Amino acid sequence: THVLRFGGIFEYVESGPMGAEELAFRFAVNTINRNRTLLPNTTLTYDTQKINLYDSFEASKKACDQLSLGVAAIFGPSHSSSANAVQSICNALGVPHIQTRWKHQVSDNKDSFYVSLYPDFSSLSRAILDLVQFFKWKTVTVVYDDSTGLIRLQELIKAPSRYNLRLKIRQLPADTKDAKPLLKEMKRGKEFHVIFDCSHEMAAGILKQALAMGMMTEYYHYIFTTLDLFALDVEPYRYSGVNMTGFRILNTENTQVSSIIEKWSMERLQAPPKPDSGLLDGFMTTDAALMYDAVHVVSVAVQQFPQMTVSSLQCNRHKPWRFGTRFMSLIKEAHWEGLTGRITFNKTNGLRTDFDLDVISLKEEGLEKIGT
Amino acid sequence: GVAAIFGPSHSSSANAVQSICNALGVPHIQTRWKHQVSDNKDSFYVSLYPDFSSLSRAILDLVQFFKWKTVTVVYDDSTGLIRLQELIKAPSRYNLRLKIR
Amino acid sequence: QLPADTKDAKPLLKEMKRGKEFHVIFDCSHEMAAGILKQALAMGMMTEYYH
Ligand SMILES: *[C@@H]1O[C@H](CO)[C@@H](O[C@@H]2O[C@H](CO)[C@@H](O[C@@H]3O[C@H](CO[C@H]4O[C@H](CO)[C@@H](O)[C@H](O)[C@@H]4O)[C@@H](O)[C@H](O[C@H]4O[C@H](CO)[C@@H](O)[C@H](O)[C@@H]4O)[C@@H]3O)[C@H](O)[C@H]2NC(C)=O)[C@H](O)[C@H]1NC(C)=O
Ligand SMILES: *[C@@H]1O[C@H](CO)[C@@H](O[C@@H]2O[C@H](CO)[C@@H](O)[C@H](O)[C@H]2NC(C)=O)[C@H](O)[C@H]1NC(C)=O
Ligand SMILES: *[C@@H]1O[C@H](CO)[C@@H](O[C@@H]2O[C@H](CO)[C@@H](O)[C@H](O)[C@H]2NC(C)=O)[C@H](O)[C@H]1NC(C)=O
């Protein structure tokens, strides 16, 4: 009648409540319900459960609990261990499974009811590979942190088979934040061009230890992979003369979009985020930005189909959801220029391989856009 | 009611049944290599297939007894690049020139 | 000469970095020597080329 119900599975915080991706999902449902102009007949409710992100069975419990309670979509357990579990819950039951962060798609996965609003690393990799040729390099050094990130950079590893690069691949130590044994080698090894593959939490920690090593002269050039380089405290580095270069998807250029981020920080007012870390405060990460888009993309789909009755499904009984294929194809065919530019999926797999990045770089006047 | 589960033998479903066996306590004896995620906090699993952290140095020893200076690693699926970590990272410490296809 | 009023000697050190001067014989008190040595780090003028 006037109610639809989205699911939700998030990490269980203990110290400091309501973590980062949970706020993005709550702020999105409240926004669409408030601004009545979009979707003007039904009100969205939510059933966010909280698990550990490294338990593929605690995820499978809370997935069937939301299926028994009755939902219309599950917005991702957001980690490669339990994402593959809840995806195959949603395939047998028929319910869509909107992911929000990249995982390893196995090449023979025969599932269909999933979309991935995080940009594919089959397209980010060629965006980096284009950017190591506009700068005309012949010797790079890919540094990653966990072993899954080597699958993230396939097209950059396979690149010296067709171009003139000379790859040298290193790995950060897994346990500590002390990568000074690594950087002493790279300073001595004459490697001035680095393509770091880290999260922005670990990218700030290397960028402080690359300053204490004196490896931040005007001879170096760091390309970061993460789409959160705009949220770095780059003020200790802006005068030195380095050229950090990264991509950026979250459109700050639009006034209608940057109004949301200004309205984001007022609920983020209760956050002293320990400013001795290296992260700017009051900025919304790109992982929370995609969850705010993922609610609106499905909200476009329910607008184009008012015949949804949220039924309750059993797991132990095997029966697909009767509005499955009708509602899933509307999600794969959608457009919504929300926070992160154009959201349009790919009809073959269901991923996102068509997006609009902004190449950002470091200058003395801050961290500025130099291309698209 | 069993005492052990002898592996679903593939990287998609091995990670599922491993985390079934961790919460239930039952051992999970694997029999073929998968991608161990570096932050997996499970304990009830053994892997009788030899690790590719040790096969990789066995290959890297064998490309030096033959005294090579130019190799060409060819793999088939993308998981196999994680299989050969220590051979890709090798020209940072030796005199090889890797070309990966 | 350092500016007399401020502790901001970044207009000075931008010239010395650009002027290729790698050898400096600073005459300061240790209160002001610590303040220049922090601003010589934010300018990136503390590589292994300087003395
Ligand atoms: C849905 O998703 C699928 C993925 O499965 C998309 O398919 C991919 O589409 C991209 C489009 O960019 C294809 O990219 C193309 O591949 C080239 C690779 O070079 C090969 O071929 C040349 C010449 O034959 C050889 O020399 C070489 O050795 C390789 O064998 C790339 O060079 C091109 O992409 C990029 O080119 C340059 C990079 O330097 C830049 O201009 C751009 O970054 C450009 O993107 C070329 O476009 C890719 O092969 C497809 N298949 C995959 C990944 O398996 C679908 O397109 C998508 N559907 C949509 C969007 O509707
Ligand atoms: C509430 O929704 C309405 C209807 O969309 C918004 O009005 C326009 O929204 C579109 C995109 O949704 C913008 O491109 C237009 O610029 C908006 N028109 C204006 C600003 O006159 C409205 O902006 C939404 N409310 C808020 C607070 O953003
Ligand atoms: C790498 O470093 C500099 C330092 O940020 C980049 O910026 C230029 O800095 C010089 C200082 O001598 C200014 O005169 C230029 O105007 C700056 N560039 C622009 C576009 O404003 C510089 O762009 C980078 N150079 C290379 C070759 O990568």
Ligand SMILES: *[C@@H]1O[C@H](CO)[C@@H](O)[C@H](O)[C@H]1NC(C)=O
């Ligand atoms: C649904 O919303 C539209 C808005 O244009 C309205 O015209 C229509 O009457 C609504 N349907 C109802 C209230 O059943």
